[PDB]
Amino acid sequence: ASVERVYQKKTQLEHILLRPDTYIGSVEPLTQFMWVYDEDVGMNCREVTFVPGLYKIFDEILVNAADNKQRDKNMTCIKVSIDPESNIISIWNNGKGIPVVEHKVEKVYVPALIFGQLLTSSNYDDDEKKVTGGRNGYGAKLCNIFSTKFTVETACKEYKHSFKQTWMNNMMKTSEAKIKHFDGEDYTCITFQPDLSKFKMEKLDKDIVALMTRRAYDLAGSCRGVKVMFNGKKLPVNGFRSYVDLYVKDKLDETGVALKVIHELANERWDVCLTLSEKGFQQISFVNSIATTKGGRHVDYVVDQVVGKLIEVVKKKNKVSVKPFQVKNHIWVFINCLIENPTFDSQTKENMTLQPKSFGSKCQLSEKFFKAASNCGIVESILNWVKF
C-alpha cells in the first residue's frame, strides 16, 4: 500500500461519520438493565436493547430545549412528540426563540450557523457562569448529521420574523430558509427523522421509544419551572420529589418493609433523595438536566458526605472495621443539581468531572438529613453484617 493510502487526513464531518462513538456513543446495539417508561407498566427496570447513539442525538435536542430556560427564565413548556410509523421526532419549547437575523461575522442566518455548522455555540464564554448543559457546540449538528431530514423552526418577536430551514441526507443538503413576518409568542421546534440505517435499525421500536419517553419524565423532574408534554399529554411530574417517587414510592425492601426515602433540598441548586439499596450502589443523577449515567464528582461529593456520617453512627455501635465501599454498597441516591460550566470526559456527558470546589455552589447536608439517613435501614443492614 502506498503512502497516500496508508496515511490519510479526514475532514471534521468525515470523522464524525467514521468515528461516531466519541461524538454520540456506540452505533451498535447495547443490551443492559436500566429504567425506561413503557406503555404498559410505566417506569420500570428491565433489560433494554437500544443503540446509544440514537438515544444521544435525541438527548442533544432535548437538553438544548432545557437549556433555553437559562436564556429565558419565562419559558414554561417543552413538548416531545415521537411517531415511529412516520419516523418523525419533534421537540418544541417556548420562551425566547433564536434571533432571526444575519450573523455579521459569519454572514449567514444565526439559526443556519448554529444548527448547520460544527463548533458553534452560545456557551463558549466561560466568564459567564451558566448552568446550561450545552458546552461544546456539537450537539444539534450531531443530530442533524445522523438524520435523513432535520428541520429548524424558530420565531423571535424581537426581530419580528420566523425562520424555517430543512437539512437532509446527513446535513449534506439544504435549501434557502423560509423567513416570514412574526408577531406572536416565541418558540423553537426541532423536527427530525433519524437516519436509522446509521444505527442498523428498521424502525423506532418499543425499547428506544421507552427510553426516549423516560428522558421526557427525567426532564419534568429535573428542569425546574418547565412542564413537559409527551405525545400531546402533560406528564404528571411536578418537581424532583414526585419524579423520585416513580422509582421508590411503591417499593419494599427484601424484608417486606417500604423503602424509607429521605429528601433534602439543600438549596436552589441541589436536591437530594436517599434510600436503601439491596443490589449494590445505585445512583440516579442529573447535572443541568443531563442524565449523568456514569456519575461524576457531584455524585461522589454527596455520597462521600453520607458515607462519612453513617460510618460515625455505625462506629457508635460497632463496639469490626466497616469500610466505605460496604456502606456505599447499601446506598441508592438521587441527585438533581445545577453546576456552573461543568466538564465531562466525552460529548455524551455521562461522567461529570468538574471538581467540587468549582461547582459554584455547595451541598452541605443538614444534621436533620443525616439523622434520617441513619434510620432508613442502611445502618441496620451494615450492623447486621458487623456480626459476620
Least spacing, CB of residue 357 vs a second copy, in Å = 9
Say whether 76 counts as a known binding-site residue.
no
Interface of this chain with ligand A1ASD, residues 173 to 232, rule: CB under 6 A: 211, 218
Q: Could you say whether residue 136 binds ligand ANP (CB under 6 A)?
A: yes
Nearest to ligand A1ASD of 75, 299 (CB atom): 299
Q: Could you say whether residue 64 binds Mg ion (CB under 5 A)?
A: yes
Cα–Cα distances in angstroms (integers) from residue 207 to residues 197, 212, 228, in the given order: 17, 9, 21
Say whether 44 counts as a known binding-site residue.
no
d(CA 184, CA 379): 57
Residue 262's SS3 state is strand
Say whether 349 counts as a known binding-site residue.
yes
Nearest to Mg ion of 75, 311 (CB atom): 75
Strand partners, 287: 290, 337
Nearest to ligand ANP of 135, 330 (CB atom): 135
Say whether 133 counts as a known binding-site residue.
no
Q: Which does 222 bind (CB under 5 to 8 A by kind): ligand A1ASD, ligand ANP, Mg ion, none?
A: none
Say whether 375 counts as a known binding-site residue.
no
Nearest to a second copy of 181, 387 (CB atom): 387
Place of cell 455501635: 317
d(CA 224, CA 265): 13
d(CA 186, CA 99): 10
Least spacing, CB of residue 257 vs ligand A1ASD, in Å = 23
Q: Number of C-alpha atoms within 13 angstroms, CB side, residue 292?
A: 30
d(CA 373, CA 11): 53
Q: Number of C-alpha atoms within 13 angstroms, CB side, residue 258?
A: 8
With contact defined as beta carbons under 8 Å apart, do 26 and 52 qualify? yes
Single residue of 16, 54, 89, 98 touching ligand ANP by CB under 6 A: 98
Q: Could you say whether residue 65 binds ligand ANP (CB under 6 A)?
A: yes
Residues near a second copy (CB under 8 A): 3-12, 15, 18-19, 21-22, 25-26, 28-30, 52, 99, 101, 103-106, 110, 113-114, 117, 119-122, 124-125, 135-137, 279-280, 294, 323, 325, 329, 343-348, 350, 353-355, 358, 384-385, 387-388
Find the helix or strand (DSSP H, E) in which 167 lies. Answer: strand 161-168
Q: Could you say whether residue 60 binds ligand ANP (CB under 6 A)?
A: yes
Say whether 139 counts as a known binding-site residue.
yes
For residue 22, is it left (φ>0), alpha (ψ between -120 and 50) or beta? Answer: alpha
Place of cell 435499525: 201
Single residue of 35, 92, 159, 301 touching ligand A1ASD by CB under 6 A: 35
Q: Which does 158 bind (CB under 5 to 8 A by kind): Mg ion, a second copy, ligand ANP, none?
A: none
Strand partners, 187: 155
Say whether 121 counts as a known binding-site residue.
yes
Least spacing, CB of residue 181 vs a second copy, in Å = 20
Those residues with Cβ within 8 angstroms of residue 44's Cβ, 6 or more apart along the chain or in another chain? 35, 36, 38
The CA dihedral of 321, 327, 330, 331, to the nearest 10 degrees, is 170
Nearest to ligand ANP of 141, 298 (CB atom): 141
Q: What does the radius of gyration of the chain's CA atoms come to, in whole angstroms?
A: 23
Instruction: Tally Cβ neighbours within 10 Å of residue 64.
Output: 21
Interface of this chain with ligand A1ASD, residues 50 to 79, rule: CB under 6 A: 52, 55
Binding site for Mg ion (CB under 5 A): 64, 134, 139
Binding site for ligand A1ASD (CB under 6 A): 25, 32, 34-35, 52, 55, 211, 218, 283-285, 291-293
Show binding-site residues for ATP: 64, 93, 121-123, 134-141, 347-349
